[PDB]
């Protein structure tokens, strides 16, 4: 929540602010308020108002220029341009869902390095415990306990559906959900991994592989019947130990329930993320869904085989071991003509409650994934961990 | 699966051919005749008709002691008056192309039918079931559907499930008496259930106490669709000092995106093995936890305690077992409901709550704590009063 | 019938009163409560709501090991958390001012319920049935509906037939499992049928071999509506050297113009006698030929062969007997069909064929020759083994 009263004091009891876009609160009189884009000198908004609130429709980063006129005056009573250097800036991520935070957060550091501001970021505690030690320049906090109280500017990074163009410059479906943060903060949009504590010594001596079979919605699962079984068996035949590191061993809704695959070691449970990083680091590689554990595995600098058909290859971070099939329905989430249902586990634009439901992922056979795994294995044996990454 | 002789097997005087395959049949040459079919036991006139030529068959196909009367138009007495008499005659009982549970349920009635009428009985079924049963039932001749040895049988009876409330090929709807007892009703014998006789001579292989489980079936309604059920049960079994083994034919089975896998923690004894090996493994098991699939019937026949988990069928639809798990607070017993109809082509069949939040709800309401409570009772019963407890 | 206490019998802490008569009841005083009802066996949350002062009852009335939880509307832990526990507690089982075969069929499940939970059980029924059963069941206290001796019972269960596919007072529709097994389902015990224990000590009075029959029924459907059935059967019985004796309560019974009388040739042992005398006569009988009426259940409990003639109910609707007579070529099982509904006010009830040519075809197809065939098998079985 933004402050009820704007944080900056202007002359003649006018209060201005940049917390939820560019805001300005006028007392009593007859005013003519003008919002400009300082970079392009375009007049973004302009109106005659007597008292009420005036906010910009755009909420993402824009170097706003606020002008407050008297209704007939030549020069401005107030004329303040956004300037963030050595100022209290608050970046608010939503209550934590991994992966999304790992994807977004590297854009928050770029925002701080660019504008040289005093930055505080609000997120769930576990992500703070994961990230905070490596980013000393940024102050971490939880949503319910923010330490700036009165911030100069606030920006709210998140996913905004329905083709929203007011809190984000472009629909995130067009540029990728994680880059979108870069666009919102107006920095270098190119993806990057977060910096983690990779100092933890190896525990398990034998070569082993980490896998993640669970996600938040069923579309993201690998809904091939014999997929995970064939993959795990093939991994074992190559001399790998296989370990599931999902948070839940069993997850699903109604009658559709997904369980940790037979043959995979049980490393599941609600553990602190640092332990997962430690285990993942010394793994030979990681085979995952588009869920967050794939982003965590990416940040630990190990090869990531990412199995997804419900999302396009360019929607997540790049990896040469991306598994994807293009002969059936695919990229259902990606399309801008469809809208994601938050209350439906089930929900297919084009085959829901039909014979072809979750075809996006069913066409991805074990043999395909095992073909990718064979390439990645030969790359690891012949060349080293240098060649992949 | 079964095709009656195109020409009736029994010869009647004036080139009339009569038969008791596919109900009571009679084929007349050309002429004028009045034909009557009677129930010899009740002396009721079942069918009255006038026909010049062609086929005359009874609408009822299940066992009835028929009495066929063929009359020349205007005659007082019958030309042919033959009543069904099965002693020392070729009788062919035809099961549907094989399934595991339905055959094990049905077949004991076939033996009663032979012991009652003292007839030469041949039964047609799939080969694996023949390999399982044949040695213990010497008096009955086993064959496959494509290679029947009795080319000209006196009477034929076709035991099976008949949906849509059929009352011509079965006396009662099988949903009213239980699918397996229906066979008894069709053959007109003692309908009370019984287990088949198996080869229980196999020596114990695994020394430690162990439990057999079956998680797979043909349609999703029969599965235990609780999220954490099988996991909690297997963990509880292990905590009691049991080894747990899955003996399903398939390790993975399902349709579309719905797929069921052998539960983590259970030993892999899956695969397409001969049934006799499954009998050998099941016999020395401490007890069995199963669905309403056939492996529960096979486990029942091996004289071990059977915990049967099902909500899509009523408790009285299968064989009796004190360890039957059932929940009556939600949807249940769709299978037994005579107002509904089973879909053979729909794997995700639940007629009343498909594609809703409450789909397969009745199965779900069966929690791991309920089944573990039954397992606790059965465990204490076994430790305290051994295997002599009924 | 029977009324539950207007105020729950068990005291809870903050003037909360809970109870297990008529399902799980709880009565809250004034305040702001959040009440949950759970199934202790499955740990499922059966019911859950926020209520200010009033009654909260479970929709299910049959036996469930309920668990009642009463919350403050913001509390973490329960103010009251009580699970059903019946050992050494006052439990009341109420049968209707019941019919004869229904009570004989049901009552064995009441004894199982007591032996399982080790409770102090009182059963309410009509006096004649009490006189019949009470001496053999000392562990259970018998009473009449109007004079119950447990004024404040811990749990109450009401065994009966509930039509219209009711699933709140009985777990399953009784047409699906059989009317008498339903009791077992209601009390959550072994549903398998059993005969009550009677006084079978009475000495033989009639020397010659004899047969007991019960012609009359309540509903015309249950009668043997074949024209010459009973006459042929009685004549055949006499030709086999049996004396034939009718033990129905009424010699004449029926409605409107449809009237049924004690068949000619059968001896008149009718009348409103105490059931114990009927038991005494039935015991030494060679066998019994009856309808689905109660006297067939009484004859069953006296451990004599029972030929049961019925078409309006399926063979599995009553107790098992190898001498069951049934015809499957016409209308049958008017009674077991879940798509139909029994009319208590209609004596001439057949839903599918009333006022047609085929009315009570259910039983008319059952000829005397059929029943005499069964009797011939049973007679040879008696003379030989
Ligand atoms: N404490 C933990 N300890 C150990 N493991 C844990 C822990 N917590 C979660 N997991 C595990 O990761 C998954 C959650 O993924 P998350 O919420 O972060 O994903 P979310 O669905 O919101 O979006 C996903 O879906 C992707 C999709 O492509 C968007 O269109 C997004 O790009 C990205 O945000 C990704 O996430 C869980 O299912 C667990 O298995
Ligand atoms: N060689 C084998 N070695 C080891 N296991 C084997 C072998 N072969 C099959 N199975 C396994 O048996 C089950 C399927 O058979 P099944 O006939 O039982 O089941 P189906 O789905 O057709 O429904 C059932 O439904 C039951 C009915 O619903 C009772 O309520 C029927 O009584 C039963 O006969 C059958 O109708 C699966 O679990 C197979 O992997
Ligand atoms: N004082 C007496 N002294 C001696 N005998 C007596 C005396 N009084 C009555 N009978 C005699 O028992 C019968 C009473 O009817 P009843 O309860 O039996 O039948 P009701 O129609 O209510 O339904 C019945 O329906 C039967 C049916 O088979 C269920 O589908 C049930 O099995 C049966 O338990 C009951 O449901 C009378 O018809 C008499 O002959
Ligand atoms: Fe899709
Ligand atoms: Fe259902
Ligand atoms: Fe009828």
Author numbering:
A (entry chain G): 11 to 399
B (entry chain K): 9 to 398
C (entry chain J): 9 to 393
Quoted passage from the original study:
A subfamily of autotransporters, including AIDA-I (adhesin involved in diffuse adherence) from diffusely adhering E. coli (DAEC) 2787 and TibA from enterotoxigenic E. coli (ETEC) H10407, are glycosylated in their passenger domains, which functions in bacterial autoaggregation and adhesion to host cells. All the 12 TibC protomers adopt an identical structure containing an N-terminal β-barrel domain, a core catalytic domain, a β-hairpin thumb, and an iron-finger motif which are arranged into a palm-like shape.
We also crystallized the TibC dodecamer in complex with its natural ligand ADP-D-glycero-β-D-manno-heptose (ADP-D,D-heptose). This was accomplished by soaking the sugar ligand into crystals of the catalytically inactive TibC D110A mutant. ADP-D,D-heptose was convincingly modeled into each protomer and a final model of 3.88 Å was obtained. The 12 sugar ligands form an array of two parallel circles along the inner surface of the dodecamer ring and face towards the hollow center. ADP-D,D-heptose is located at the cleft between the two lobes of the catalytic domain. The adenine heterocycle fits snugly into a hydrophilic pocket and its N1 atom bears a hydrogen bond contact with Arg-286 of TibC. The hydrogen bond contact, though weak, is incompatible with a guanine due to its saturated N1, providing a structural basis for the specificity of TibC in using ADP-activated sugar donor. The β-phosphate has strong interactions with Thr-226 and Lys-230 in the ligand-binding pocket of TibC. Asp-110 is located close to the anomeric hydroxyl of heptose in the TibC–ADP-D,D-heptose complex structure. In TibC, residue 300 is a proline and its main-chain carbonyl oxygen forms two hydrogen bonds with D,D-heptose hydroxyl O4 and O6, respectively.
